[PDB]
């Protein structure tokens, strides 16, 4: 029992520390798929213009 | 005749039925039974294992 409780306290602390480091990653789910499409067009144009 | 609800998960023990009978006959008073109440914990080792499983 005493070993299990100590393991929970350690993992909980590690999670709290990682969530704080990842504050910028947690914002609004803009449709990742749309950004990639747009990027695809821009790159393709860039290549053609070069 | 407190018709044992057949669907109660806990079936009445012979001890319980005997105690009930003794109380109905006025030979035993509920006060006498209350004063005799043993809070002795039953199955302590099984309870500890349940707590460990939850934490895990």
């Amino acid at each position: 029992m005493s070993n299990s409780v100590e393991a929970l306290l350690e993992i909980s602390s590690s999670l709290k520390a990682l969530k704080e480091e990842c504050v910028d990653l947690c914002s609004s789910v803009t449709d990742g798929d749309k950004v990639i499409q747009s990027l695809r067009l821009a790159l393709t144009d860039f290549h053609q213009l070069t | 005749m407190m018709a044992a609800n057949p669907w109660s998960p806990v079936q009445p023990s012979a001890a319980s039925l005997l105690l009930e009978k003794c109380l109905a006959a006025g030979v035993l008073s509920q006060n006498a039974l209350d004063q005799a109440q043993l809070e002795a914990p039953c199955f302590s080792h099984a309870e500890e294992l349940q707590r460990i499983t939850e934490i895990k």
Side-chain angles (χ1 to χ4, degrees):
Chain A
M1 182 64 80
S2 189
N3 287 347
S4 296
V5 173
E6 200 172 3
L8 189 87
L9 284 164
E10 196 157 7
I11 283 167
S12 271
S13 179
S14 296
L15 195 93
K16 200 179 178 178
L18 197 74
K19 277 184 181 178
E20 275 174 7
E21 277 182 3
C22 292
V23 174
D24 295 331
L25 293 160
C26 292
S27 330
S28 65
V29 182
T30 22
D31 228 345
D33 273 342
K34 278 183 184 179
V35 175
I36 287 178
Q37 284 182 355
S38 183
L39 206 90
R40 198 176 180 179
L41 277 151
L43 273 158
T44 308
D45 288 350
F46 182 70
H47 183 63
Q48 288 180 350
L49 286 167
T50 308
Chain B
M1 249 186 181
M2 270 193 84
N5 198 352
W7 305 96
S8 176
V10 180
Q11 300 294 332
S13 73
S16 177
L17 291 169
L18 205 101
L19 284 169
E20 280 180 1
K21 190 175 177 178
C22 288
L23 283 165
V27 288
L28 244 125
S29 73
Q30 192 63 29
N31 267 353
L33 282 165
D34 290 340
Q35 266 177 358
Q37 233 174 359
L38 267 130
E39 272 187 357
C42 304
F43 309 122
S44 55
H45 289 89
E47 276 185 357
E48 196 175 3
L49 192 82
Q50 191 175 1
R51 282 187 189 172
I52 292 173
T53 312
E54 286 170 7
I55 292 173
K56 282 183 180 178

